[PDB]
Amino acid sequence: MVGVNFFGDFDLASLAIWSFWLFFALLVYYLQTENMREGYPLENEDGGPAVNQGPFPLPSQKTFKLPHGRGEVTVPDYKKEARDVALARTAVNDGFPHAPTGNPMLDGVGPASWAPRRDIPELDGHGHAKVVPMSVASAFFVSAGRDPRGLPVIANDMKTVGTVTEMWVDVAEHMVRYLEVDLASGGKCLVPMTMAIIKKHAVVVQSISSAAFASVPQTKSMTEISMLEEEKICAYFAGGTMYCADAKPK
Amino acid sequence: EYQNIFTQVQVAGKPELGMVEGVNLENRTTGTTNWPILGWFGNAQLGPIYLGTLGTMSLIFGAFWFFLVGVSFIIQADYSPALFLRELFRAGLFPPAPEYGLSLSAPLMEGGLWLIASFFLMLSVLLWWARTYKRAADLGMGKHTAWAFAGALWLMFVLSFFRPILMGSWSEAVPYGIFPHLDWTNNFSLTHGNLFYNPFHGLSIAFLYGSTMLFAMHGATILAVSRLGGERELEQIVDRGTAAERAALFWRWTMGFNATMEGIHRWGWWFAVLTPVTGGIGILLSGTVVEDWSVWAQVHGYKAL
Amino acid sequence: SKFYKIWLIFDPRRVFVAQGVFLFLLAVMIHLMLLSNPGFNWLDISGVKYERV
Amino acid sequence: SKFYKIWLIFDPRRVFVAQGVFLFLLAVMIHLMLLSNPGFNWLDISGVKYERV
Amino acid sequence: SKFYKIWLIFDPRRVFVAQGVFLFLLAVMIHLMLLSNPGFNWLDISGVKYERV
Amino acid sequence: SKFYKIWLIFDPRRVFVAQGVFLFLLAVMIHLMLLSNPGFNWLDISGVKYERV
Amino acid sequence: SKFYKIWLIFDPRRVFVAQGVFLFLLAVMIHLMLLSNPGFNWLDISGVKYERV
Amino acid sequence: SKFYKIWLIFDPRRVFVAQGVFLFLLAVMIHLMLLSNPGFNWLD
Amino acid sequence: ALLSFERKYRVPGGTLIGGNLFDFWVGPFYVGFFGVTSVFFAALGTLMILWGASLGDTWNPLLISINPPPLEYGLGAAPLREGGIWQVVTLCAIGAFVSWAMREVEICRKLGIGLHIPFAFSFAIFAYITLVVIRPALMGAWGHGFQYGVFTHLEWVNNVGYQYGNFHYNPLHMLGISLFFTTTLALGLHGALILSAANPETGKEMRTPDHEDTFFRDLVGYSVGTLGIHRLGLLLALNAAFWSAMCILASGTVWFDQWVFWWDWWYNLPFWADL
Amino acid sequence: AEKHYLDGATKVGMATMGAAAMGKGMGITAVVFFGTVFFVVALAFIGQFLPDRSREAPYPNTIFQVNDIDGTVDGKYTRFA
Amino acid sequence: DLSFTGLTDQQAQELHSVYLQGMWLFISVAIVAHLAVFIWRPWL
Amino acid sequence: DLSFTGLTDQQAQELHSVYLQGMWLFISVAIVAHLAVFIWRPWL
Amino acid sequence: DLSFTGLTDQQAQELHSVYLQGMWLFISVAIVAHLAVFIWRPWL
Amino acid sequence: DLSFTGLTDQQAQELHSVYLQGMWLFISVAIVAHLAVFIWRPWL
């Protein structure tokens, strides 16, 4: 097929490349609409439907079946977020930040925002609780690196809030996910391993002040943790990265 | 701040032997070792493997192809273990010369051994493809891995099976040396004008770059939202948490549009798969349809003059 | 005869968008076919007919 | 005869869309084959027949 | 006749946006086609007509 | 006619921003097209007319 | 006219930011275009005018 | 005249910092535009 | 138009330079101080590209090319039609790329999350800056940068590649290619595995992350894990960028012959030197 | 004081605040700019000590005669070669 | 009463009649165009 | 009396009238410019 | 009473008045500059 | 009133007067620089 052309200089190669462009436009349409199964329809800044919705219409509903008798999930769901957010707009126009109306960390807004997940523990493939204290797992042991248990924990101001007393591990993926802190405040606390640095003398948490440690979102039980509790704890620390940054030295 | 790049403390319990969802357990080995130098980066368990009919057959055919390439090297070294080691990268098992066309009648040390080895290499990759399919089927999973592997195999087969047949000569297939197949790539671009002016070579590069860039972006995104239960990507697909939301809002605020937890993997799947799919198309058209991509670009208005 | 009931199975929105896109692309390609042929390129044909229009 | 039961097994939406796509592509490739062959290229044939039409 | 019921099926916002974009793109394509053709490129035509305007 | 009812469909802010962007890009493109043509490049024309201005 | 009602539509903070960005960008562009033309590059014009300024 | 009302919409601290940045950037544009011209570069 | 969960994240704070002066959104886009600078740099660079195109003879967006100054200007600022437009665009490109990263930092600070994304993009920026700044400075001429054009910068890639014979024989180039190929393979496998678990065979419940560990352990004997695959993809892509930049930096600065002759250290080892 | 100035002093406290802020912005910009210029100048200086064959590489860009904006239609940077 | 699409039967009837009217208009215009083109430059 | 934008019918009318005045002013300036350009360098 | 920005009609009028004074000053300076440049080197 | 910055009317006037003093000082130094350069190497 060399030198033999359709249409007067339109080749099998020209045909192939134009065919690819057509297919790729269709694939971009497909990919974009697949990626619209969360967060749509667009809202306005008062919780009502937005005037504009974009060139791409929403995809057809798709269902996920969940193992271990945890029902079905269909998306896009067209539902609005199932939590109230203690903000208030700073301008009558659009495109400007909304300001917290109370304590941003206690209310759960901004970088401290939590999503309303189900109040049940995430499960492993065998239907057991996926993240548990090692007192429950009981076959897990420290394999390498330094064990943080017994070390003092130091907040983002250089003050010690307590000691590491327990690790919470993921039994499916063999990982430590939380450090249980016993507080001199008087109670206990879970700290995400992703937010703690273990050193020889202490575990240092550079996101949360010592006063913040007095109010960390609690868990109902000390043998399992729900996805909602996980969201609240991790959101509290990630929000501290903004709302506690002034307590740092200097 | 802890960058989730390396694990701080490793932990280990009973070794995990796998899910049982229709896998023939007697084809799954039983021995795992736990290697902590890997546990700094990823999992420490060197787990069991599954070994059934397809895997055994694929390994036999591939190992025999490997062996035959090695034997050819030994023979062309004139038996010298010194030349064999000195030329481990510079030697190749080359296809038959052009005068033999597509016939199976070329001397054993001038393409015949190349043909035999190529046949067994063909057999093993197809059996490995069937393996990728059947391991998914035995667990009840979708077939995305096998489809993605089919795209890469398509580039492989246009390289040495489809295009040499359409050109009428085994002599255009790629040799089995480390340095000689790079020489083959350079020669291929040089004989077909310049392969930069091949639009499907351009599109293949775009998807290679984009797949590298996309997985820089996605790995960085997941690591950045790891403070939240971020890398548990499954279960964020069905129960959206703040990790998925903040990941979406980062890219929405940055570039004006975002993906979803499930859908970023479709983008990556398609960008990765389209690299060999589009590349194979461009090689197939080279020589068969276009002889000189430079003059073709000049005629099609994207090379000057 | 009774082809209408297809609208009970195929959603008219997708059908109409698909038909519009296909019809436009087909028309574009037929015109480009004719323009690339120097026997049906009306611009150059008129240039010749009217002595450089 | 009794073939209607195939519509109990194959979803008509998928089958109809697939068949439309396939028929269109087949027709396009046959026309392109005819155009590429300079014995059935009707534009050039008519150009020759009417002395540049 | 009674084409108006299309607005009962297609959302006006998307349709109007798409029509505006398509019409502008089509007009641009045609103008560029004419400028690319050196028989309908009106700038050079005027340059010749007025003897280097 | 009564085109004002467009403002029941489209938000004025979005339309005004889109219109401004469109008009700016259009004006830039037309001026650049004129300047690239040495029949409407006013800087060089004035250089010629005034003997290097 | 009564164009003051633009400020019932567009907020002044963002409008002023966008206006400053656009105006500075346009001024820089026009000056750059003049510098690139060898009839309106004032530095070289003054170089010629005074025999190397 | 009433241009002082600009400080009712834009906070003066931030504007002062931004204006320092902008003025230095404008200066570097002008200086190295001058360096681009052979007849006005002062290094040599 | 906000996503249905977006509102609770649109709070003040996280900025680096100008406080609340630019702390607002335009549509989806956060602006901030570096949004202003990135927009200005991007617009000015695009608009100088268009102006440079106007001075040529084509408006075809595949033939437009802005060329660096000739070598005789060295590292000086060139006349604006003799390479100066290229330098202006290059400075605008650096300004916009760096501003884009700083804007990404501010968005990460507002949504309190790690800074991995701007870090990775900075690796991409470093590859670009190696191409247009670092290597031409060491060689002593801006004209060793690559011309800006959809298909003419490929002419640069070609000419520089064939200056050192076949560029394949560049060990850092080999390392970079392997990292590009491997990151593409890893993206394919990771996307496929996620999609397979989320989209099972028809009628089956959704698969668990145990099933996907099991899938790779069955297929190859090893599973890096969910956290591990993202660390791996990130570092693979970053290393590909860095070793590509080292590849090109070495050529013409510290190595000058055909890259094939570099391996003569192995081929001329004295025991098998003469064989 | 829920205002960065309240009493202000109306001519001197405000003037010092504004001088401090504008000088801070200009000073950080100056630091960044001169660091970058110094880095480039250092790279050029170092490149002066590379082997002489670092100055033998030919011009790596192709001039296509349709992108040649020098003033003459020749396909090259005129007045040099 | 299977409705993949939610239309009632008579809604499908009206929709089909309108669609057919539009189709016939398009086809008639194309027929006239083809006759004009065939007179101007015949291609069979 | 429903609308996508939330504007009342009266609000849309005054909006449109002011917008039309602006468009007409823009167009009249463009018209004067085109007459000037055509007298200076006719393109038809 | 249509108000997106939150202003009242009076504040919009006052703001527009000050804005127009700024714009007219800028345009007057630009006009003077263009007249000077046209005398120095005419471009039409 | 229309106060985004939280200043009062009187604070804005005073800060504007200080800003004007600083800006005229900057412009006067710039004028001296331009006169020196123009004497040295005139660009018009």
Ligand code: BCL
């Ligand atoms: C002088 C050299 C030429 C050139 C000549 C070629 C040629 C020739 C080809 C490419 C191809 C490619 N080129 Mg090149 N190319 C050049 C310049 C470049 C530049 C550059 C910056 O200059 C870049 C980035 C690229 C990039 C690329 C890739 C996008 C593309 C391969 C895609 C792919 O999937 O590969 C990786 C994937 C594969 C190789 C598929 C096969 C792998 C199989 C599946 C492996 C299975 C297992 C195996 C059998 C056994 C071992 C396993 C055991 C465990 C041990 N080219 C210049 C112009 N290029 C290819 C292409 O697609 O072109 C259109 C191709 O054939």
Ligand code: BCL
């Ligand atoms: C004749 C040609 C030579 C050759 C000569 C060269 C030369 C010369 C070079 C390479 C380089 C590379 N080559 Mg080689 N190469 C050849 C053959 C190959 C083959 C092959 C199969 O044959 C392959 C796979 C490769 C592969 C590669 C990569 C390792 C590398 C390019 C990646 C890179 O730099 O990313 C780095 C990524 C970037 C620079 C991108 C930066 C992006 C910036 C930050 C953002 C831009 C935004 C944009 C303006 C925005 C637009 C806005 C829109 C809204 C989107 N080469 C042959 C043998 N190759 C290059 C390299 O290593 O460069 C460092 C290089 O210079």
Ligand SMILES: CC[C@H]1c2cc3[nH]c4c(c3C)C(=O)[C@H](C(=O)OC)c4c3nc(cc4[nH]c(cc(n2)[C@@H]1C)c(C(C)=O)c4C)[C@@H](C)[C@@H]3CCC(=O)OC/C=C(\C)CCC[C@H](C)CCC[C@H](C)CCCC(C)C
């Ligand atoms: C989307 C496109 C990308 C991609 C996709 C892809 N590749 C894939 C997959 C996918 C989705 C798989 O599922 C499959 C896989 O299983 O991956 C883990 C595979 C895979 N891609 C691979 C490689 C690969 N992919 C490449 C490319 C890419 N693959 C693309 C970039 C490349 C490149 C860039 O060149 C390579 C080299 C493999 C890891 C794997 C396929 C496994 C395979 O082919 O097995 C066949 C087996 C053999 C040839 C047997 C070899 C046996 C040993 C030599 C035995 C040694 C014995 C002893 C040392 C002695 C030997 C000699 C004698 C004495 C015996």
Ligand SMILES: CCCCCCCCCCCCCCCCCC(=O)OC[C@H](COP(=O)(O)OCCN)OC(=O)CCCCCCCCCCCCCCCCC
């Ligand atoms: C001066 C010229 C300017 C252009 C020339 C530059 C070259 C362009 C080539 C690549 C195109 C990049 C342009 C990307 C546009 C960025 C703006 C953007 O995408 O956001 C706008 C839009 C709105 O977002 P949203 O409202 O959320 O959409 C869903 C609601 N219905 O968001 C969307 O549209 C969502 C759809 C996402 C679009 C998918 C992106 C495709 C990128 C894949 C390219 C890879 C292959 C490229 C091959 C290159 C070959 C050379």
Ligand SMILES: COC(C)(C)C/C=C/C(C)=C/C=C/C(C)=C/C=C/C(C)=C/C=C/C=C(C)/C=C/C=C(/C)CC/C=C(/C)CCC=C(C)C
């Ligand atoms: C193509 O390239 C080139 C660049 C050739 C041509 C480009 C031309 C362009 C586009 C140029 C753009 C020029 C512009 C937009 C210039 C804007 C200049 C401005 C607004 C300058 C304002 C300066 C204001 C200052 C310095 C204010 C200082 C205020 C203070 C409070 C400082 C405090 C210190 C004192 C002493 C205050 C005085 C107080 C008392 C009590 C005396």
Ligand SMILES: COC(C)(C)C/C=C/C(C)=C/C=C/C(C)=C/C=C/C(C)=C/C=C/C=C(C)/C=C\C=C(\C)CC/C=C(\C)CCC=C(C)C
């Ligand atoms: C030959 O090359 C060709 C290729 C050049 C390239 C392109 C050719 C083509 C296709 C050109 C097509 C051009 C088009 C589509 C042009 C259309 C232009 C339009 C629609 C211009 C409209 C301008 C409208 C303006 C300026 C409107 C209003 C301005 C105002 C100041 C009104 C203010 C509004 C207010 C105050 C509303 C507030 C009211 C209330 C009640 C709050």
Ligand SMILES: COC(C)(C)C/C=C/C(C)=C/C=C/C(C)=C/C=C/C(C)=C/C=C/C=C(C)\C=C/C=C(/C)CC/C=C(/C)CCC=C(C)C
């Ligand atoms: C100590 O024992 C031994 C002897 C181990 C020492 C061994 C040394 C060894 C094993 C050396 C091996 C070295 C190398 C360099 C192996 C790798 C070579 C490369 C670069 C391979 C890349 C190949 C690329 C492609 C596209 C290969 C094949 C593609 C196909 C489609 C295969 C099918 C093609 C044909 C013609 C099948 C023929 C079928 C019939 C019926 C004739």
Ligand SMILES: COC(C)(C)C/C=C/C(C)=C/C=C/C(C)=C/C=C/C(C)=C/C=C\C=C(C)/C=C\C=C(\C)CC/C=C(\C)CCC=C(C)C
């Ligand atoms: C390119 O050259 C060669 C010759 C290579 C190859 C030729 C290839 C082939 C196969 C060409 C023919 C392809 C086909 C299948 C053509 C058939 C087209 C058909 C069946 C069109 C059917 C209906 C046409 C219209 C225009 C339908 C409805 C009326 C409208 C006004 C369109 C928009 C309205 C829609 C979509 C529904 C709502 C109804 C109204 C009235 C608004």
Ligand SMILES: COC(C)(C)C/C=C/C(C)=C/C=C/C(C)=C\C=C\C(C)=C\C=C\C=C(C)\C=C\C=C(\C)CC/C=C(/C)CCC=C(C)C
């Ligand atoms: C070759 O030709 C090329 C290619 C150049 C293409 C041509 C492109 C062009 C020229 C495109 C268009 C340019 C356009 C359409 C418009 C420019 C408009 C301008 C110059 C607007 C300038 C306005 C200046 C102003 C408003 C100055 C304001 C200063 C002030 C102090 C105003 C203070 C304002 C207020 C509201 C104070 C606050 C009051 C209260 C009560 C809060």
Ligand SMILES: [Fe+3]
């Ligand atoms: Fe992932």
